[PDB]
Amino acid sequence: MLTDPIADMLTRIRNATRVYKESTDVPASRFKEEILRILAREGFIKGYERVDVDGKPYLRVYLKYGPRRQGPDPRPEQVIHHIRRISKPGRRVYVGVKEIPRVRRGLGIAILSTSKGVLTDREARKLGVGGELICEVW
Amino acid sequence: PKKVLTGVVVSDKMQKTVTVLVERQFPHPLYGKVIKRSKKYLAHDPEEKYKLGDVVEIIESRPISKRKRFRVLRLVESGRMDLVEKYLIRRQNYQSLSK
Amino acid sequence: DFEEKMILIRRTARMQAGGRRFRFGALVVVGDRQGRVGLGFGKAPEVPLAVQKAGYYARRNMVEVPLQNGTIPHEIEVEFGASKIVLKPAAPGTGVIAGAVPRAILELAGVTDILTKELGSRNPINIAYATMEALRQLRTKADVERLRKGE
Amino acid sequence: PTINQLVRKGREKVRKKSKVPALKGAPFRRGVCTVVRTVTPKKPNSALRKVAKVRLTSGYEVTAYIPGEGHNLQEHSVVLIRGGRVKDLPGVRYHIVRGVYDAAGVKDRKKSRSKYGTKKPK
Amino acid sequence: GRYIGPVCRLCRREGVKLYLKGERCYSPKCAMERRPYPPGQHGQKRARRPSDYAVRLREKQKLRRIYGISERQFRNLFEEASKKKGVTGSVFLGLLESRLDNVVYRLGFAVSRRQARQLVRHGHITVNGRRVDLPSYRVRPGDEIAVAEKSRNLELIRQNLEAMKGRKVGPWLSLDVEGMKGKFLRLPDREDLALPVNEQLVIEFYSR
RNA sequence: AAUGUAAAAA
RNA sequence: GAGGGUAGGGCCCGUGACUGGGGCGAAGUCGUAACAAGGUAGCUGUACCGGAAGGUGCGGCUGGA
RNA sequence: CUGGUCCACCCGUGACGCUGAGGCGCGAAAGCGUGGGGAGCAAACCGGAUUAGAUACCCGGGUAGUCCACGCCCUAAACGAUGCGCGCUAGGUCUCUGGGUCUCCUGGGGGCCGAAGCUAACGCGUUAAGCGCGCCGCCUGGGGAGUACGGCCGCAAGGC
RNA sequence: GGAGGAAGAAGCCCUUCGGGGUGUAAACUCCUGAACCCGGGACGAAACCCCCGAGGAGGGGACUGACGGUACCGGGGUAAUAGCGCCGGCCAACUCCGUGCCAGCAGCCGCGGUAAUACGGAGGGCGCGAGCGUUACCCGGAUUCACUGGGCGUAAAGGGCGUGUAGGCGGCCUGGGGCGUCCCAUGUGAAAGACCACGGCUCAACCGUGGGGGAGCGUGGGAUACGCUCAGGCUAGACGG
RNA sequence: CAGCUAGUUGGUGGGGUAAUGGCCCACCAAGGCGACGACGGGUAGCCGGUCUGAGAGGAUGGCCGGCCACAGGGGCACUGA
Ligand SMILES: [Mg+2]
Ligand SMILES: [Mg+2]
Ligand SMILES: [Mg+2]
Ligand SMILES: [Mg+2]
Ligand SMILES: [Mg+2]
Ligand SMILES: [Mg+2]
Ligand SMILES: [Mg+2]
Ligand SMILES: [Mg+2]
Ligand SMILES: [Mg+2]
Ligand SMILES: [Mg+2]
Ligand SMILES: [Mg+2]
Ligand SMILES: [Mg+2]
Ligand SMILES: [Mg+2]
Ligand SMILES: [Mg+2]
Ligand SMILES: [Mg+2]
Ligand SMILES: [Mg+2]
Ligand SMILES: [Mg+2]
Ligand SMILES: [Mg+2]
Ligand SMILES: [Mg+2]
Ligand SMILES: [Mg+2]
Ligand SMILES: [Mg+2]
Ligand SMILES: [Mg+2]
Ligand SMILES: [Mg+2]
Ligand SMILES: [Mg+2]
Ligand SMILES: [Mg+2]
Ligand SMILES: [Mg+2]
Ligand SMILES: [Mg+2]
Ligand SMILES: [Mg+2]
Ligand SMILES: [Mg+2]
Ligand SMILES: [Mg+2]
Ligand SMILES: [Mg+2]
Ligand SMILES: [Mg+2]
Ligand SMILES: [Mg+2]
Ligand SMILES: [Mg+2]
Ligand SMILES: [Mg+2]
Ligand SMILES: [Mg+2]
Ligand SMILES: [Mg+2]
Ligand SMILES: [Mg+2]
Ligand SMILES: [Mg+2]
Ligand SMILES: [Mg+2]
Ligand SMILES: [Mg+2]
Ligand SMILES: [Mg+2]
Ligand SMILES: [Mg+2]
Ligand SMILES: [Mg+2]
Ligand SMILES: [Mg+2]
Ligand SMILES: [Mg+2]
Ligand SMILES: [Mg+2]
Ligand SMILES: [Mg+2]
Ligand SMILES: [Mg+2]
Ligand SMILES: [Mg+2]
Ligand SMILES: [Mg+2]
Ligand SMILES: [Mg+2]
Ligand SMILES: [Mg+2]
Ligand SMILES: [Mg+2]
Ligand SMILES: [Mg+2]
Ligand SMILES: [Mg+2]
Ligand SMILES: [Mg+2]
Ligand SMILES: [Mg+2]
Ligand SMILES: [Mg+2]
Ligand SMILES: [Mg+2]
Ligand SMILES: [Mg+2]
Ligand SMILES: [Mg+2]
Ligand SMILES: [Mg+2]
Ligand SMILES: [Mg+2]
Ligand SMILES: [Mg+2]
Ligand SMILES: [Mg+2]
Ligand SMILES: [Mg+2]
Ligand SMILES: [Mg+2]
Ligand SMILES: [Mg+2]
Ligand SMILES: [Mg+2]
Ligand SMILES: [Mg+2]
Ligand SMILES: [Mg+2]
Ligand SMILES: [Mg+2]
Ligand SMILES: [Mg+2]
Ligand SMILES: [Mg+2]
Ligand SMILES: [Mg+2]
Ligand SMILES: [Mg+2]
Ligand SMILES: [Mg+2]
Ligand SMILES: [Mg+2]
Ligand SMILES: [Mg+2]
Ligand SMILES: [Mg+2]
Ligand SMILES: [Mg+2]
Ligand SMILES: [Mg+2]
Ligand SMILES: [Mg+2]
Ligand SMILES: [Mg+2]
Ligand SMILES: [Mg+2]
Ligand SMILES: [Mg+2]
Ligand SMILES: [Mg+2]
Ligand SMILES: [Mg+2]
Ligand SMILES: [Mg+2]
Ligand SMILES: [Mg+2]
Ligand SMILES: [Mg+2]
Ligand SMILES: [Mg+2]
Ligand SMILES: [Mg+2]
Ligand SMILES: [Mg+2]
Ligand SMILES: [Mg+2]
Ligand SMILES: [Mg+2]
Ligand SMILES: [Mg+2]
Ligand SMILES: [Mg+2]
Ligand SMILES: [Mg+2]
Ligand SMILES: [Mg+2]
Ligand SMILES: [Mg+2]
Ligand SMILES: [Mg+2]
Ligand SMILES: [Mg+2]
Ligand SMILES: [Mg+2]
Ligand SMILES: [Mg+2]
Ligand SMILES: [Mg+2]
Ligand SMILES: [Mg+2]
Ligand SMILES: [Mg+2]
Ligand SMILES: [Mg+2]
Ligand SMILES: [Mg+2]
Ligand SMILES: [Mg+2]
Ligand SMILES: [Mg+2]
Ligand SMILES: [Mg+2]
Ligand SMILES: [Mg+2]
Ligand SMILES: [Mg+2]
Ligand SMILES: [Mg+2]
Ligand SMILES: [Mg+2]
Ligand SMILES: [Mg+2]
Ligand SMILES: [Mg+2]
Ligand SMILES: [Mg+2]
Ligand SMILES: [Mg+2]
Ligand SMILES: [Mg+2]
Ligand SMILES: [Mg+2]
Ligand SMILES: [Mg+2]
Ligand SMILES: [Mg+2]
Ligand SMILES: [Mg+2]
Ligand SMILES: [Mg+2]
Ligand SMILES: [Mg+2]
Ligand SMILES: [Mg+2]
Ligand SMILES: [Mg+2]
Ligand SMILES: [Mg+2]
Ligand SMILES: [Mg+2]
Ligand SMILES: [Mg+2]
Ligand SMILES: [Mg+2]
Ligand SMILES: [Mg+2]
Ligand SMILES: [Mg+2]
Ligand SMILES: [Mg+2]
Ligand SMILES: [Mg+2]
Ligand SMILES: [Mg+2]
Ligand SMILES: [Mg+2]
Ligand SMILES: [Mg+2]
Ligand SMILES: [Mg+2]
Ligand SMILES: [Mg+2]
Ligand SMILES: [Mg+2]
Ligand SMILES: [Mg+2]
Ligand SMILES: [Mg+2]
Ligand SMILES: [Mg+2]
Ligand SMILES: [Mg+2]
Ligand SMILES: [Mg+2]
Ligand SMILES: [Mg+2]
Ligand SMILES: [Mg+2]
Ligand SMILES: [Mg+2]
Ligand SMILES: [Mg+2]
Ligand SMILES: [Mg+2]
Ligand SMILES: [Mg+2]
Ligand SMILES: [Mg+2]
Ligand SMILES: [Mg+2]
Ligand SMILES: [Mg+2]
Ligand SMILES: [Mg+2]
Ligand SMILES: [Mg+2]
Ligand SMILES: [Mg+2]
Ligand SMILES: [Mg+2]
Ligand SMILES: [Mg+2]
Ligand SMILES: [Mg+2]
Ligand SMILES: [Mg+2]
Ligand SMILES: [Mg+2]
Ligand SMILES: [Mg+2]
Ligand SMILES: [Mg+2]
Ligand SMILES: [Mg+2]
Ligand SMILES: [Mg+2]
Ligand SMILES: [Mg+2]
Ligand SMILES: [Mg+2]
Ligand SMILES: [Mg+2]
Ligand SMILES: [Mg+2]
Ligand SMILES: [Mg+2]
Ligand SMILES: [Mg+2]
Ligand SMILES: [Mg+2]
Ligand SMILES: [Mg+2]
Ligand SMILES: [Mg+2]
Ligand SMILES: [Mg+2]
Ligand SMILES: [Mg+2]
Ligand SMILES: [Mg+2]
Ligand SMILES: [Mg+2]
Ligand SMILES: [Mg+2]
Ligand SMILES: [Mg+2]
Ligand SMILES: [Mg+2]
Ligand SMILES: [Mg+2]
Ligand SMILES: [Mg+2]
Ligand SMILES: [Mg+2]
Ligand SMILES: [Mg+2]
Ligand SMILES: [Mg+2]
Ligand SMILES: [Mg+2]
Ligand SMILES: [Mg+2]
Ligand SMILES: [Mg+2]
Ligand SMILES: [Mg+2]
Ligand SMILES: [Mg+2]
Ligand SMILES: [Mg+2]
Ligand SMILES: [Mg+2]
Ligand SMILES: [Mg+2]
Ligand SMILES: [Mg+2]
Ligand SMILES: [Mg+2]
Ligand SMILES: [Mg+2]
Ligand SMILES: [Mg+2]
Ligand SMILES: [Mg+2]
Ligand SMILES: [Mg+2]
Ligand SMILES: [Mg+2]
Ligand SMILES: [Zn+2]
């Protein structure tokens, strides 16, 4: 039945990055888009694009990574080190603009839904709106 | 203002009177989650025009009786047993609690 | 050549017919009080030899640390299996406020303002290892945009 | 647990409990000595301690330690109770107070007289 | 009351010169000069590795004996600076240095902070004219501190001011030995002060 | 093919 | 109608000959069940039984080979 | 007579889903009731032997029970000591079962070794103890104790 | 009390019997002058009241101070109370004698059974000082009830197993409503208090004035992405042939 | 502590009151409340605030200010805005 399509997507990306895939797909959905769109615009992913598995709308999400490392375990540093859903289905989180979180002292982002649209933490303050704190990413 | 609420008549087994059940959601004071609670008000129906299942607005009002301090404002929709069931099954399962 | 400071020198032991002999733990930190830092844990049947040995390992394993006026860039939480440690940025005049271990680290790190706490376990050793990693995961604004670029 | 489980059952409060029924949780309680006696210590030590069973204002009847060297308590000494157990002695949750009522101070103590009710030597 | 009991025994406990004496501490014996090691029966014995506490402790105890001031008062001031916006560490010093009895010393009116206290206390000093016998009096920037009338002609005041010729002092201060007065020009920058101590270590001490 | 109390580790 | 009186129940506390087990106690009597195939692998639900640990039966588990 | 489950076709419904306090049903063995049955085995019980003793291990004997019907009891190392549902995250090999022209593939099951990762370690690892969300159950120092009081259930033993 | 004040009195403790310590500490020297003393001596009090102006507006006049001869100012003026906790580890502070599982200590770990930095006294030291310690209780540490911020194979913890009521949670597309939610506007959120600034009493505590924000609820307006909700469509879930 | 309830829930009319009201009364109808914790027991005046705490939280209500309650225990009404 799949509980939270969002947490899923976020997770799909986390599970994929760790193994360094080039792109994991995800079941398509308008609201899901924005998350990517922003997530990409800020520089967390090379990009995304609609696709189709055996007659099912999905989304390719081309992952970004750091350069190779020297020494034991040439594991390439991540571009997404951290990603986590805040407002869950079993606990909706809502914040006023006068109280929106600063992810990793500004290094990080905090995407969130709002009456004006899905916006970054900063863009939230920009247009001065609060909303459902979706998740943060750094 | 005379704050108005909205709920379904769950009882009409009374003269010129009806019982109205209304829920109200809200964020929990410590864990956020949008819990919901309800309450029964006794509404003054002078015509006995509002039967069971009717969803209705009811207004804060002059005392009518010990518990009647709300009048029936207007109809909202008729067929609504689905709700009446909820509250009635609730009463049911009480049988299966005592000892 | 840098600075030198040991966190502890414990005497471990081992059984063997007829008695017990002991090696000697010795954890030491070393730094220039200016970004370059390195931790070391030496062992040997001699206290001096042990600290000496920790000295060699210290300068071996090292780590540059992005210092913003004596504080750390962003806050980070790092759990070394057992224990866990928090690290927070603070304005000048705050001082290094932490358990004796992470102090040695951050002090010889050249850090001078920082809020911190040891949650979870607290074994000096593991908290040591933990902090090193934590700093080793600090990233300057550049590092960020530099990775988040990929031009 | 889930959040919801919390929203139901919820978090049980610690609720601690006392170590001294000096009653009214007062700072001290008066009483009369019922019996002045000397008792052997516990598991790892030994040395007959100076103790007395006191009847409380609070209708009780507790055993209490007489600190210091030598004392003057007898089967009718009124005295002040202080509370503080003793690792060495089985069930003894109170100290007597030297230097109040019929309980003298420690004779000739020069160091830390405050804890042994002893006046300042000239 | 202040520390009354022996002074030159602390010059000796901290191991750093403590200038809470007169001519003597500059003489060839701050007491410390003849014995560079702690008081008591031991003093010259194999010194032990100090606990982080011991170290942090010494530092604060050092800084306090310097200004010669009640622990209570000392702490409160620390807190007072912790409140206000500003580099807590240095600011603390600023409040310390801002005390009247301090000013008087810095300004050469007296040879000793302790002595200076007795001068303020016995009312020989005056701020902006109205006499002030309060050592703790926080001298704000722009106050004219000087010697009072019946006071001006006193031996001690004389000799001190006499010897106060030339010898420049404190960028945040300005003397006038002619008229026996000076000015708290401004609040002293950290650098102006040159204490043998370290504010940070004290900051730390007060986390415990 | 039973059992050996009770004061030893900077 | 305060309150008194009468009768009958409910909860809670204190107290009681004696009695059940429990905790603690540098040393006692009995044996040695367990910890190594602990010298019959142990452990377990249960049932009988025996000064005491226990034993045995049925099944079950390896935290046994 | 009947329950579950798996595979092929992509034909029908159209979010009808997931979890689940209480409730209800099932629930090894031993045990209880009434009636039956009884070969072998075997608590208790007796005799032999061993031993300081031996109510035990070993041997000879031996009743309830073990078997059936109907009813009751409801506990366990009821153990993978791991609640269920869904999505995601390298492969290697063994085996049970289905579909496909097939040294191969595709599904559902049972095992071992292992990516990444998790773990206090042992270890786990697409049958997760990894990464995530939903829902329930449970924990919060050792002893006293699964004891006591109360309540409920039970013929009883006794259970919750 | 302030400055000076010996290669450093006596006394006392330690010692490898040379010496080391208390220690600039004292004495002593000069200076200053709490207390005490004499003279002065408040603010807090202008109004009600009376005169003119009408008895009003406005102007004008006078009476009353409990604290108190106190605060404070002026002059004179004597070197003028120091105590308590601790010094095994946490925990800053070490030696000596006495003692001998005794006398005793104790917050945790533990310490004392002839040689104790752990008992008790001494010398010395660390900490604070008109205080210092103790007992009692609250919050802290305790992310040890965990919302922030924990867990459950073996450490304490998955229910014996299933069916299922209530509740909780709910896939993809579009539309209306706008409950939740976000925004703005206004009402309210007394004073006192908290924080900031500046002023008053010699400082300070205490006090005055001014400033700011505040969760929360009431009214109005607005946004509609996520949640909800009515409505419409789909087939990836689930079910069915 | 798991069920509670006869002025009990509602109505009609009536008393009473500054006034609404089972507040009290006559008749009528059978209702009202409860796992979202009724009914029962134990405790307690409540807030502005105070204390601690990184905070979220916890604890707490002395003095000052606000409201409530009482005036040896209990009941009653009289005068009156
Ligand atoms: Mg790659
Ligand atoms: Mg960009
Ligand atoms: Mg009707
Ligand atoms: Mg709200
Ligand atoms: Mg009952
Ligand atoms: Mg160098
Ligand atoms: Mg260098
Ligand atoms: Mg060195
Ligand atoms: Mg290594
Ligand atoms: Mg080497
Ligand atoms: Mg670099
Ligand atoms: Mg760097
Ligand atoms: Mg962990
Ligand atoms: Mg520990
Ligand atoms: Mg430990
Ligand atoms: Mg780096
Ligand atoms: Mg770098
Ligand atoms: Mg004994
Ligand atoms: Mg005696
Ligand atoms: Mg006697
Ligand atoms: Mg005497
Ligand atoms: Mg003592
Ligand atoms: Mg601060
Ligand atoms: Mg502050
Ligand atoms: Mg700052
Ligand atoms: Mg500051
Ligand atoms: Mg100058
Ligand atoms: Mg603090
Ligand atoms: Mg024996
Ligand atoms: Mg024996
Ligand atoms: Mg033994
Ligand atoms: Mg009566
Ligand atoms: Mg009666
Ligand atoms: Mg009576
Ligand atoms: Mg009769
Ligand atoms: Mg009775
Ligand atoms: Mg009784
Ligand atoms: Mg008994
Ligand atoms: Mg028993
Ligand atoms: Mg017994
Ligand atoms: Mg008994
Ligand atoms: Mg027992
Ligand atoms: Mg015994
Ligand atoms: Mg005997
Ligand atoms: Mg025995
Ligand atoms: Mg024996
Ligand atoms: Mg045995
Ligand atoms: Mg045997
Ligand atoms: Mg065995
Ligand atoms: Mg058995
Ligand atoms: Mg017998
Ligand atoms: Mg068996
Ligand atoms: Mg089985
Ligand atoms: Mg085993
Ligand atoms: Mg074998
Ligand atoms: Mg079949
Ligand atoms: Mg067809
Ligand atoms: Mg269709
Ligand atoms: Mg739906
Ligand atoms: Mg059964
Ligand atoms: Mg059977
Ligand atoms: Mg039987
Ligand atoms: Mg039978
Ligand atoms: Mg029978
Ligand atoms: Mg019969
Ligand atoms: Mg039979
Ligand atoms: Mg037979
Ligand atoms: Mg046989
Ligand atoms: Mg037998
Ligand atoms: Mg036999
Ligand atoms: Mg014989
Ligand atoms: Mg025999
Ligand atoms: Mg046999
Ligand atoms: Mg048969
Ligand atoms: Mg048959
Ligand atoms: Mg039959
Ligand atoms: Mg379950
Ligand atoms: Mg199912
Ligand atoms: Mg096949
Ligand atoms: Mg094919
Ligand atoms: Mg083919
Ligand atoms: Mg096919
Ligand atoms: Mg073939
Ligand atoms: Mg093959
Ligand atoms: Mg293949
Ligand atoms: Mg196959
Ligand atoms: Mg398989
Ligand atoms: Mg397979
Ligand atoms: Mg494996
Ligand atoms: Mg690996
Ligand atoms: Mg799979
Ligand atoms: Mg899969
Ligand atoms: Mg596999
Ligand atoms: Mg799975
Ligand atoms: Mg795991
Ligand atoms: Mg695990
Ligand atoms: Mg417990
Ligand atoms: Mg306990
Ligand atoms: Mg317990
Ligand atoms: Mg138990
Ligand atoms: Mg227990
Ligand atoms: Mg049992
Ligand atoms: Mg029982
Ligand atoms: Mg009971
Ligand atoms: Mg009882
Ligand atoms: Mg019972
Ligand atoms: Mg019965
Ligand atoms: Mg029977
Ligand atoms: Mg059970
Ligand atoms: Mg002097
Ligand atoms: Mg000397
Ligand atoms: Mg000498
Ligand atoms: Mg002279
Ligand atoms: Mg003179
Ligand atoms: Mg006097
Ligand atoms: Mg006058
Ligand atoms: Mg006047
Ligand atoms: Mg006046
Ligand atoms: Mg006047
Ligand atoms: Mg008059
Ligand atoms: Mg006139
Ligand atoms: Mg006139
Ligand atoms: Mg006039
Ligand atoms: Mg006038
Ligand atoms: Mg006038
Ligand atoms: Mg007077
Ligand atoms: Mg006077
Ligand atoms: Mg006079
Ligand atoms: Mg006069
Ligand atoms: Mg006078
Ligand atoms: Mg006077
Ligand atoms: Mg005058
Ligand atoms: Mg005067
Ligand atoms: Mg004078
Ligand atoms: Mg004198
Ligand atoms: Mg003198
Ligand atoms: Mg102390
Ligand atoms: Mg301390
Ligand atoms: Mg020390
Ligand atoms: Mg003796
Ligand atoms: Mg002797
Ligand atoms: Mg000795
Ligand atoms: Mg000894
Ligand atoms: Mg001690
Ligand atoms: Mg001692
Ligand atoms: Mg002394
Ligand atoms: Mg004072
Ligand atoms: Mg606490
Ligand atoms: Mg606590
Ligand atoms: Mg807490
Ligand atoms: Mg835990
Ligand atoms: Mg789990
Ligand atoms: Mg327990
Ligand atoms: Mg289940
Ligand atoms: Mg179940
Ligand atoms: Mg179990
Ligand atoms: Mg059960
Ligand atoms: Mg189910
Ligand atoms: Mg449902
Ligand atoms: Mg939805
Ligand atoms: Mg729903
Ligand atoms: Mg929906
Ligand atoms: Mg919609
Ligand atoms: Mg609406
Ligand atoms: Mg607003
Ligand atoms: Mg407020
Ligand atoms: Mg407002
Ligand atoms: Mg306002
Ligand atoms: Mg206010
Ligand atoms: Mg506060
Ligand atoms: Mg102003
Ligand atoms: Mg001022
Ligand atoms: Mg004055
Ligand atoms: Mg104000
Ligand atoms: Mg204000
Ligand atoms: Mg506020
Ligand atoms: Mg506001
Ligand atoms: Mg609201
Ligand atoms: Mg819409
Ligand atoms: Mg429809
Ligand atoms: Mg639909
Ligand atoms: Mg399908
Ligand atoms: Mg009736
Ligand atoms: Mg009426
Ligand atoms: Mg009236
Ligand atoms: Mg009534
Ligand atoms: Mg009526
Ligand atoms: Mg009636
Ligand atoms: Mg109640
Ligand atoms: Mg309270
Ligand atoms: Mg408030
Ligand atoms: Mg409050
Ligand atoms: Mg509050
Ligand atoms: Mg605070
Ligand atoms: Mg609070
Ligand atoms: Mg708390
Ligand atoms: Mg009050
Ligand atoms: Mg109170
Ligand atoms: Mg009072
Ligand atoms: Mg009063
Ligand atoms: Mg009072
Ligand atoms: Mg009040
Ligand atoms: Mg009100
Ligand atoms: Mg009364
Ligand atoms: Mg009365
Ligand atoms: Mg009275
Ligand atoms: Mg009366
Ligand atoms: Zn000196």
Side-chain angles (χ1 to χ4, degrees), chain E residues 68 74 134:
Chain E
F74 188 81
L134 286 10

Side-chain angles (χ1 to χ4, degrees), chain A residues 53-93:
Chain A
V53 178
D54 290 277
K56 309 169 193 318
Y58 281 103
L59 310 164
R60 293 291 175 64
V61 192
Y62 304 79
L63 316 170
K64 197 191 287 191
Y65 300 89
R68 192 155 176 254
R69 284 320 188 191
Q70 284 270 301
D73 262 29
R75 332 292 280 88
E77 154 92 321
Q78 284 276 345
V79 165
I80 314 82
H81 315 110
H82 182 102
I83 187 182
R84 169 179 60 149
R85 181 156 176 97
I86 296 304
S87 176
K88 313 176 201 307
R91 179 196 213 322
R92 319 303 280 206
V93 194

Side-chain angles (χ1 to χ4, degrees), chain E residues 140-143 145 169-174 182-187:
Chain E
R140 314 177 315 119
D143 308 6
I145 327 82
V169 59
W172 74 103
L173 297 175
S174 80
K183 268 167 156 297
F184 197 99
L185 312 181
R186 74 171 197 269
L187 284 158

Side-chain angles (χ1 to χ4, degrees), chain B residues 3-8 10 20-26 34-41 55-56 58 80 82-88 90:
Chain B
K3 181 164 83 171
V4 191
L5 332 173
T6 48
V8 261
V10 94
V20 190
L21 152 60
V22 305
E23 293 183 14
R24 47 146 202 153
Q25 35 197 343
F26 71 86
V34 205
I35 80 196
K36 309 189 312 174
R37 270 78 219 277
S38 66
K39 169 173 193 160
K40 298 193 293 183
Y41 301 81
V55 192
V56 281
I58 42 82
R80 284 262 86 191
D82 52 328
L83 319 170
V84 161
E85 301 301 317
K86 297 264 191 174
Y87 160 89
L88 276 169
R90 179 175 156 185

Side-chain angles (χ1 to χ4, degrees), chain B residues 11 15-17 38 40 62-63 65 67 90 94 99:
Chain B
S11 177
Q15 310 185 193
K16 323 191 83 174
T17 308
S38 66
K40 298 193 293 183
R62 172 218 299 184
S65 75
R67 301 198 67 215
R90 179 175 156 185
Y94 283 168
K99 55 283 267 283

Side-chain angles (χ1 to χ4, degrees), chain A residues 7-135:
Chain A
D8 175 286
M9 167 166 69
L10 305 189
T11 303
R12 292 264 194 97
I13 308 162
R14 195 200 298 107
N15 279 335
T17 64
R18 270 71 186 106
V19 322
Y20 296 92
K21 288 294 177 188
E22 184 171 7
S23 155
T24 306
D25 334 320
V26 35
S29 176
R30 167 177 160 272
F31 174 83
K32 267 190 267 203
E33 278 262 328
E34 308 291 73
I35 325 287
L36 304 150
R37 150 212 159 217
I38 297 194
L39 190 52
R41 169 226 285 168
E42 290 282 342
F44 285 108
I45 40 175
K46 286 179 184 168
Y48 77 82
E49 62 162 293
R50 303 88 177 329
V51 260
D52 204 75
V53 178
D54 290 277
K56 309 169 193 318
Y58 281 103
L59 310 164
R60 293 291 175 64
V61 192
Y62 304 79
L63 316 170
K64 197 191 287 191
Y65 300 89
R68 192 155 176 254
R69 284 320 188 191
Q70 284 270 301
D73 262 29
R75 332 292 280 88
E77 154 92 321
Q78 284 276 345
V79 165
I80 314 82
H81 315 110
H82 182 102
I83 187 182
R84 169 179 60 149
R85 181 156 176 97
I86 296 304
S87 176
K88 313 176 201 307
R91 179 196 213 322
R92 319 303 280 206
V93 194
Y94 297 120
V95 306
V97 65
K98 294 272 133 53
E99 25 143 299
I100 302 177
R102 322 90 302 185
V103 187
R104 214 149 85 148
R105 269 297 185 181
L107 285 193
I109 183 190
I111 31 195
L112 70 94
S113 188
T114 208
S115 324
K116 295 304 170 69
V118 197
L119 333 174
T120 100
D121 47 2
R122 301 179 285 206
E123 285 180 340
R125 275 172 276 273
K126 209 180 210 170
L127 301 313
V129 285
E132 184 170 305
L133 204 187
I134 296 313
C135 56

Side-chain angles (χ1 to χ4, degrees), chain C residues 75-89:
Chain C
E75 20 83 350
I76 61 160
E77 304 164 8
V78 178
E79 323 188 14
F80 188 129
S83 41
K84 167 190 181 185
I85 180 189
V86 192
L87 290 168
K88 280 191 81 170

